[PDB]
């Protein structure tokens, strides 16, 4: 409840600036959460850093679970700009961590701005350099509808994940349900298949 | 050239000219001795099999085959099955002629000893020859073999001891006693442990019910008095001898009198004949199978100290752990048994025996009765050979193919033991739990496809065909990939279990096809939670005899359902599953001569045909012939034959298939 | 009391079968047919008896007097009927079993020994008379077609293509062709035979029409021969000419709403004496009535509780 | 009141002696009946 004086100062800039701003966050949602296990392991975690890093998805989960709609509404939006904002990669771990436990809780996945903000996750997936949510979350986008953008995207993803195998396999799909030679040379580029290219 | 004009009387001298060429060229090269005796036994073969539309063209023929196996496996010295089990048959064969007498003789003490390791059951099944000479050398092999490795012989020697024709037994006994000289202790050890765990497989009682419910129904189906008169004698025979432990004592203070009344009664017909005797005993018969009926489901729990005084009282001996045994390793001796058998409800009541050997490791086991586990002991090292196949080829061990396995070891003729996997998992169980947690009903399709239609099991095949589709179309069937993603700790080690998956099932596919197993319903099928991979059980109905079966048979070659489809990949099949179909097909196409002789190896037992053959090897013939087929493109006409990708796709085509889905037995689970 | 020109007579999974006729869409009498299914249905010309063939029991029923049960019943076959049918003067009976062979029943309460069966290797589904009661013709699950004469006891087998299942096999009393259909859309039409001489039943494939993409139901001729209608598993019946096989008509039941999902199949149709109105039977537990041309339906049966499967429709000699 | 059915078998080894006789007996082979006629939908037209 007193926790929105947190975020919404819209003035981190660099690295270290973000880092120290997770670390109060933390501190905050560590420090008051009504269940007196946490509640006690807070004053440690003010003086050791990172055993309350590996903590993060329990007070989060737990104050969540507390917070109402508009609070949960403006919590959501807030994280939403923070990691569209940022780039380093341990912020973008930690995040990504949060939700992927969050997915697997019986409370369904946190609802972001547009079908769980899956476009945009793996969006800054790829530029962590973590893969295998990346080809998760393309599964998730493919289920839904087919579209030439998304099999690329598979092409090169697989390519990156070493796995030739499952190119081959997106590109017999690609010629067998969508079938209309839309396919641009540099998918055989991208899949070695020099012949066919030329 | 043989490749060119294949095989006549004009083209084998040539061709053995020019490999005698070879051989003398460089006398010291593997593979030309190796196709020079190839050459030779094919050659003989081709003369048996002409002759029968003047033996010593055909000993000549074989002579020089026999000097080349030998000459080659002492070239070999890491891995030869093949040509040890060539000439092994030719010693079967043709053993009895005096010419074959000496090539097989120096041949044998020429070569080293730890080689007949991968041949130690092949040899115990033919110990009972009828030909003096082949025996008196198995003899002396087995003999050389036990003084310098006993372990390794032991258990199937014990095995033989305990068996029921005269020869075989006798032939056991005198050889078991040749064995004792040098070491003793550890055959009067071996032969107390076996005969006395055998008796916590199949108890007394579930004894004698099983034996009463066959004669039941041979009576009842074959009027034949004598049959049930040999079907239930060897209990009694058994019977007479006495109790030995307090269980045996109850079940005696309970039933006795009225098993040796109904005995007195049935001989008494058979001084006479006339129905007003035995109506009596077979009346007291079935009153006694009424009472053993009602109390079999409550059995649970048994403790050593009421059924076997004299296991727990060992605490140390001089056996290995049976079944796990390596020339290259030291020994590790059973410390210890547990005081306390789980049994694990089923129709079969298999036991879960578990031991502690010397360095503090347990050993958990499977105890089972009412089978046979010797046709598993073959299928497992035909397994473990193309294991062997997979392993030294660069292509496919990058991607690292292997079929796991697990410890096999039969006991007796109608039971033994059976390893167990740690952490494994029946996928029946996974789907099982998966939807009672989403409180889900078990069988919502079996429901829907009853409900549209009552007589389910009585349509014509394209109703079944379209009430399948109308069912399986109903409900959308995801739950393996959500239950094992839901079932992972992080993203990257779920996509590796996946990969996993998908390779292991194609090859245990491939190989399934190739063997002709059968039943594979989702309770013969296992999980690793921790890899990932498949396992594979029930290698009991094998060599295409299901798809040959009257009452519900099978069109299809193996199990590839939407369940195990969709939770594979997103693109469907053909990504990693096709392109490993068609890597290991090529990789055993390409050494067609080893499992082939293998298989044969396999098949020729005549021990083991009782199951297939309900000449006389005519019907063995035309399975062979067959298998060959398999491995030569030429299965769906002989008069053509296609590419690996064109047997690959018509295999997939047929495996998936809803036309051909509908036949299967119901239980077998086609909706899933 | 069916004692009328014009029969309807209507099956399915419900173990009844229910008559009515053409005049209002209203039933008159329903019939107890438990324990089972019914594979097909026929009356006899002398509008005496009718015989509904299913799953080891061809069971009787009369027409015009009224009485709830089986009178008359033949058993001897393990499983399934595939087909049946009369002779058309009332003789004898000819029926496929599923198995592998077809008989003969005679309806004449003597010894005299005229039933014969025939031998196939393969599991027979469609079988069809010459409408002069001399050959006949047995189609399988394995694209081999048996032309079969009494005159001897042996069939002559033919196999335009392997591999695939023919459903449908159907001649016109006029005697004009050959027309059958397989399991994915391709249809054969064949010139007749002329050979009355030594029952030599020579044949020549004309025309292979490629047609309904999903599996094909059924095809029909006219009783005039000059026209085709067949029957679709994508929820459609189509019809042609005899003349050139031109595109007649064409109707069909996809509502146009993903709500349905193919909640039944147009399983058969009949013509009517006249050769210009049918009656389509769907597994949609209701059945239609329409007319050749304008498309749009007239009439319409829906008192059924479970899918319906197959009807049996007969008219006056009159039109 | 339940006998009121009457069913049949099958009996094999049936004309598996006398060919003669069933070389005509059902040999009538009769052809005929070409000539179609028109109609006017008769029933039909008390249909409608």
């Known amino acids: 409840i007193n926790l929105q004086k947190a975020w919404g100062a819209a003035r981190r800039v660099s690295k270290d600036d973000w880092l120290e701003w997770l670390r109060r966050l933390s501190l905050e949602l560590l420090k008051d959460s009504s269940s007196p296990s946490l509640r006690s392991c807070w004053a440690l975690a003010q003086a050791y850093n990172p055993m309350a890093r590996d903590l993060f998805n329990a007070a989060f989960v737990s104050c969540w679970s507390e917070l109402n709609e508009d609070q949960q509404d403006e919590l959501i939006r807030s994280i939403e700009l923070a990691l569209t904002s940022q780039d380093i990669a341990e912020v973008t771990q930690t995040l990504l961590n949060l939700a992927e436990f969050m997915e697997h809780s019986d409370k369904g996945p946190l609802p972001l701005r547009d079908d769980n903000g899956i476009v945009l996750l793996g969006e800054r997936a790829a530029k962590c350099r973590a893969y295998a949510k990346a080809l998760h979350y393309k599964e998730l986008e493919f289920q839904k509808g087919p579209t030439p953008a998304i099999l690329e995207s598979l092409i090169s993803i697989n390519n990156k994940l070493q796995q030739p195998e499952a190119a081959a396999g997106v590109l017999e799909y690609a010629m067998k349900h969508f079938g209309e030679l839309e396919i641009q040379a540099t998918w055989y580029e991208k899949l070695h298949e020099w012949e066919d290219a030329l | ?672 | 009391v069916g004692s009328d020109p014009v029969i309807l007579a209507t099956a399915g999974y419900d173990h009844t079968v229910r008559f009515w006729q053409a005049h209002s869409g209203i039933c008159t009498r329903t019939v107890q047919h438990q324990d089972s299914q019914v594979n097909a249905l026929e009356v006899t010309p002398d509008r005496s008896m009718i015989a509904a063939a299913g799953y080891q029991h061809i069971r009787m029923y009369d027409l015009n007097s009224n009485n709830p049960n089986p009178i008359i019943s033949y058993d001897g076959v393990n499983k399934n009927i595939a087909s049946v049918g009369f002779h058309e003067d009332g003789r004898w009976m000819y029926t496929g079993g599923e198995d592998c062979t077809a008989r003969i029943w005679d309806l004449r309460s003597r010894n005299l020994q005229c039933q014969r069966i025939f031998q196939v290797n393969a599991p027979i589904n469609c079988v069809c008379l010459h409408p002069n009661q001399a050959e006949l013709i047995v189609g399988d699950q394995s694209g081999a077609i048996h032309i079969w004469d009494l005159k001897t006891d042996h069939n002559e087998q033919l196999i335009p293509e392997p591999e695939v299942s023919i459903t449908s096999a159907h001649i016109d009393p006029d005697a004009s062709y050959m027309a059958a259909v397989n399991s994915t859309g391709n249809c054969y039409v064949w010139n007749l035979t002329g050979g009355i001489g030594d029952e030599v039943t020579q044949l020549i494939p004309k025309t292979k029409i490629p047609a309904h993409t999903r599996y094909a139901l059924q095809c029909r001729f006219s009783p005039d021969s000059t026209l085709l209608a067949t029957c679709s598993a994508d929820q459609t019946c189509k019809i042609w000419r005899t003349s050139n096989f031109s595109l007649m008509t064409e109707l069909s039941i996809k509502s146009g709403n993903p709500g349905e999902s193919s909640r039944g199949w147009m399983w058969g149709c009949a013509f009517s004496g006249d050769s210009q109105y049918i009656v389509t039977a769907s597994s949609d537990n209701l059945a239609r009535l329409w007319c050749v041309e304008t498309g749009e339906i007239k009439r319409e049966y829906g008192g059924h509780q479970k899918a319906v499967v197959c009807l049996a429709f007969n008219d006056s000699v009159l039109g | 009141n339940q006998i009121k059915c009457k069913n049949i078998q099958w009996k094999e080894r049936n004309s598996k002696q006398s060919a003669q006789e069933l070389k005509s007996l059902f040999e009538k082979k009769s052809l005929k009946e070409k000539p179609p006629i028109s109609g006017k939908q008769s029933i039909l037209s008390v249909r409608l």
């Not at chain 2, 055998?198 to 041979?218: K, N, P, Q, T």
């Not at chain 2, 109904?262 to 005797?277: F, H, I, L, P």
């Not at chain 2, 005993?281 to 009421?306: C, G, M, N």
């Not at chain 2, 079969?348 to 503090?360: A, D, I, Y």
Request: with cysteine.
């Open chain 2, 1 to 672: 050239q043989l490749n060119l004009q294949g095989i006549n009387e004009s083209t084998i001298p040539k061709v053995l000219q020019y490999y005698s060429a070879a051989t003398e060229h460089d006398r010291s090269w593997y593979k030309a001795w190796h196709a020079w005796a190839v050459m030779n036994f094919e050659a003989v073969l081709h003369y048996k099999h002409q002759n029968q539309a003047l033996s010593k063209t055909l000993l000549m023929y074989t002579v020089p085959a026999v000097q080349g196996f030998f000459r080659s496996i002492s070239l070999s010295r890491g891995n030869n099955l093949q040509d040890t089990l060539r000439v092994l048959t030719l010693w079967f064969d043709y053993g009895h002629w005096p010419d074959v007498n000496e090539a097989l003789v120096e041949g044998v003490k020429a070569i080293q000893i730890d080689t007949w390791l991968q041949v130690i059951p092949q040899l115990i099944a033919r110990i009972d020859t009828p030909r003096p000479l082949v025996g008196r050398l198995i003899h002396q092999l087995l003999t050389d073999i036990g003084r310098y490795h006993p372990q390794a012989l032991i258990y199937p020697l014990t095995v033989a001891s305990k068996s029921t024709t005269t020869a075989r037994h006798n032939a056991a006994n005198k050889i078991l006693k040749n064995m004792c000289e040098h070491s003793n202790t550890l055959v009067q050890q071996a032969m107390m442990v076996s005969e006395e765990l055998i008796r916590v497989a199949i108890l007394w009682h579930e004894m004698w019910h099983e034996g009463l419910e066959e004669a039941s129904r041979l009576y009842f189906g074959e009027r034949n008095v004598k049959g049930m008169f040999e079907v239930l004698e060897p209990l009694h025979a058994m019977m007479e001898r006495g109790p030995q432990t307090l269980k045996e004592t109850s079940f005696n203070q309970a039933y006795g009198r009225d098993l040796m009344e109904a005995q007195e009664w049935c001989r008494k017909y058979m001084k006479s004949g006339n129905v007003k005797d035995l109506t009596q005993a077979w009346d007291l018969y079935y009153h006694v199978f009424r009472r053993i009926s009602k109390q079999l489901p409550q059995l649970t729990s048994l403790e050593l100290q009421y059924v076997s005084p004299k296991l727990l009282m060992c605490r140390d001996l001089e056996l290995a752990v049976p079944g796990t045994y390596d020339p290259n390793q030291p020994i590790i001796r059973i410390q210890s048994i547990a005081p306390s058998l789980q049994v694990i409800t089923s129709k079969q009541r298999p036991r879960k025996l578990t031991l502690m050997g010397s360095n503090g490791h347990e050993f958990v086991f499977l105890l089972k009765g009412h089978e046979d586990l010797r046709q598993d002991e073959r299928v497992m090292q035909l397994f473990g050979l193309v294991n062997t196949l997979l392993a030294n080829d660069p292509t496919s061990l990058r991607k690292n193919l292997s079929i796991q396995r697990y410890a096999v070891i039969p006991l007796s003729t109608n039971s033994g033991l059976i390893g167990w996997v740690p952490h494994c998992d029946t996928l029946h169980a996974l789907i099982r739990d998966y939807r009672e947690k989403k409180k889900i009903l078990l069988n919502i399709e079996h429901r829907i496809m009853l409900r549209m239609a009552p007589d389910y099991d009585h349509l014509t095949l394209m109703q079944k065909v379209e009430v399948f589709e109308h069912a399986v179309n109903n409900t959308a069937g995801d739950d393996l990939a959500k239950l094992l993603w839901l079932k992972s700790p992080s993203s990257e080690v779920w996509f590796d279990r996946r990969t996993n998956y998908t390779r292991s099932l194609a090859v245990m596919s491939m190989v399934g096809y190739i063997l002709g197993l059968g039943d594979r319903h989702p309770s013969n099928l296992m999980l690793d939670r921790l890899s990932g991979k498949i396992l594979h059980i029930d290698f009991g109905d094998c060599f295409e005899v299901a798809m040959t079966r009257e009452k519900f048979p099978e069109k299809i070659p193996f199990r590839l359902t939407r369940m195990l489809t969709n939770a594979m990949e997103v693109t469907g099949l053909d990504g990693n599953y096709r392109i490993t179909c068609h890597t290991v097909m090529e990789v055993l196409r390409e050494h067609k001569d080893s499992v082939m002789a293998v298989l044969e190896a396999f098949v020729y037992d005549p021990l083991l045909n009782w199951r297939l053959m309900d000449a006389l090897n005519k019907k063995a013939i035309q399975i062979i012939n067959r298998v060959r087929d398999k491995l030569t493109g030429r299965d769906f006409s002989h008069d053509d034959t296609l590419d690996v990708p064109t047997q690959v796709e018509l295999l997939i085509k047929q495996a998936t298939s809803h036309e051909n889905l509908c036949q299967c037995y119901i239980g077998w689970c086609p909706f899933w």
